């Protein structure tokens with residue numbers, strides 16, 4: 013199924029009938045970082061498998077729902093169970109849910125992820141406001157927009173200079189200052205490692221030379237689809253570890269250690285993003 | 294359809310019957326840079342859609358013709374409507390038209406493109422003679438030659454050391470000196486960004502570190518197919534902007550600004566390439 | 575055919591019945607470096623085409639056998655005719671033979687390849703013990719593990735920090751010292767160029783900046799599948815040429831020159847690896 017205007021419209025039609033919610037904010041949460049979705053008020057849970065033209069996700073399994081409702085007086089739509097390109101989903105399968113968000117009315121997309129730290133200033137448990145990216149799949153002919161252009165959503169050749177909204181970064185930092193956790197909050201450049209292997213120690217060292225501050229396996233495909241169709245983005249990484257220090261000390265990593273860091277910061281991130289949603293212009 | 298010997302031959306058979314032209318020069322022109330094709334003498338226009346085994350191009354639409362005739366006393370064949378890998382064409386679809394050129398008799402291929410400037414010496418409106426390249430798709434398992442080798446055209450493992458002919462670069466510079474526009478003409482290394490998004494500001498900064506002078510979304514796939522089968526290449530970029538200056542000043546870009554630069558230099562480029570064709574050994 | 579548990583088991587069943595050999599060492603040899611396979615004792619030769627669920631290799635042609643038997647008192651299984659991703663094989667086709675090795679009992683995989691030298695200390699005819707890698711296809715969304723995870727073999731997110739066993743590197747160097755050819759043996763970082771074109775002179779210069787010591791078109795896909803499923807690896811490159819010196823002097827390369835270097839070192843490499851096999855703990 014192509015992520016075109018007709019097919020995105022059929023999915024939006026079904027959602028509108030079932031939920032009665034008209035959202036203007038969308039959220040996509042990282043692994044272990046989705047507790048906010050369980051606190052949406054007057055919520056409606058829609059399994060992907062029920063929605064016309066949504067991508068098939070039964071080979072990977074696990075949760076896959078769209079959740080609509082209210083947070084802080086604001087109408088939102090959330091993806092519960094994010095789609096990652098290392099699972100083998102096509103460009104069209106990744107893009108269709110973001111384009112349905114656009115047709116539903118979404119004007120701002122908030123995204124979190126887990127990432128490895130490259131910059132020597134970053135420690136486990138820190139947050140990084142993403143201000144730009146290095147897209148190795150895009151340079152290498154695996155950009156999420158390779159294929160015919162869907163003209164109703166955006167232009168053939170997008171400019172990504174302003175993909176990460178500066179005012180949303182400033183609001184996020186302001187709220188961290190108000191609650192006295194600004195000492196945890198950095199800004200930086202995100203490198204997209206297609207995955208699913210963690211980057212190797214020699215790859216981490218290369219990324220340090222090339223000006224990257226953090227590395228992860230998500231987020232950039234969704235940012236590009238959002239920017240193409242005029243949706244503003246805030247993206248925040250939670251740092252699991254410092255890859256460069258771990259290479260110097262020959263320390264390993266595994267998904268369990270990553271999820272332990274997510275549990276340690278889950279409740280603070282939930283409170284932060286509730287306030288960002290409440291305060292969005 | 295595979296870009297093999299049998300299928301390229303069937304296309305060449307059809308073309309030979311309809312045109313009666315035996316070309317020894319091929320040309321592929323960048324966007325907004327194709328006016329020379331409309332001045333080919335005693336010309337024959339063949340829609341791709343009419344030619345056996347040519348790739349299907351109706352999803353993208355717009356012009357798609359092969360044009361044969363004479364320039365400066367020389368027999369040429371032109372692609373009007375270039376095929377780009379960011380549109381989703383396969384390796385086989387890109388390679389088949391170049392291999393038909395080879396079977397028709399082409400010994401020299403001339404190519405222009407629009408590109409972003411990285412080297413601090415480059416300004417909007419400058420020309421760069423391409424002397425080498427950095428092929429991010431090729432390093433990343435999206436090289437145009439991935440697949441079985443077509444032995445009748447070339448070897449399994451090509452050497453690209455001499456893909457950009459030195460004597461053709463010297464002729465191009467000589468003719469610019471004769472007409473007193475050598476102040477516009479540089480040489481440099483071309484980075485292939487698969488596209489279709491312009492490279493991000495942090496990607497431009499990375500490319501400066503890695504020794505790239507210009508960046509674009511075309512040309513390298515065709516150069517590799519030509520080099521594989523023994524066709525000599527001259528490739529020239531027209532610089533739309535300096536990506537590094539625009540990042541320092543937070544200036545945006547869009548396809549309209551690119552095409553305005555092409556219109557500004559179209560007539561000079563047409564005159565330059567007519568003389569290069571006339572003067573080729 | 576997916577490289578899953580059921581399909582790998584059917585292939586292992588067939589092999590077990592025909593060979594009666596239970597191997598605990600696997601070997602994959604580079605081009606022109608396979609003479610050891612012809613000296614396996616009490617050997618059994620099984621054409622890939624006869625084995626259930628093995629990948630189809632008739633478009634490329636040439637030899638394709640699994641060979642089982644004894645070396646130095648140890649039970650081994652060899653791939654005669656390696657599968658390379660530049661030929662167009664899928665992730666699933668590359669992974670299935672390594673996963674059959676795992677089900678047969680393989681605990682250690684030994685690999686050789688031919689490679690270009692980047693580090694200024696490397697000369698034609700030198701050996702490099704691989705201690706880490708830079709995987710441009712993996713960064714760029716062409717990692718061999720993209721797709722659903724096969725949980726019976728390994729985890730969704732592997733750590734490659736220890737993919738190249740340190741004790742096996744130390745054994746290999748010890749045996750070179752015993753036979754007084756340690757002056758030929760270096761260690762270094764391997765860059766994976768997807769291929770099939772040799773990397774360009776400007777790509778070689780980029781790789782020098784990024785900390786790479788050698789460059790080649792194989793090995794990293796097999797290493798990742800082995801590490802995922804708990805098989806220890808030793809990988810050794812034979813250096814064909816120094817790419818940086820050849821760029822400074824405008825010297826070309828071709829597959830014939832590569833194979834001449836392999837013939838020059840074939841007999842020494844055969845003797846080295848026989849002793850490594852004999853001495854493995």
Ligand SMILES: N#Cc1c(F)cccc1NCCc1ccccn1
Nearest residue numbers: 126127128210211228229252258265
């Ligand atoms: N890519 C990525 C990534 C990620 F997506 C989430 C968390 C950490 C990541 N890299 C860590 C690299 C590393 C490898 C081995 C030991 C220590 N560190």
Ligand SMILES: N#Cc1c(F)cccc1NCCc1ccccn1
Nearest residue numbers: 407408409491492509510533539546
């Ligand atoms: N890739 C490519 C490219 C091209 F193919 C043609 C013309 C310009 C290109 N990059 C410009 C990068 C850039 C982004 C945002 C603002 C200014 N500059």
Ligand SMILES: N#Cc1c(F)cccc1NCCc1ccccn1
Nearest residue numbers: 688689690772773790791814820827
């Ligand atoms: N990639 C790779 C590679 C290889 F797989 C085996 C042997 C040599 C390799 N590069 C040599 C680069 C080069 C290009 C032109 C002239 C001299 N040198």
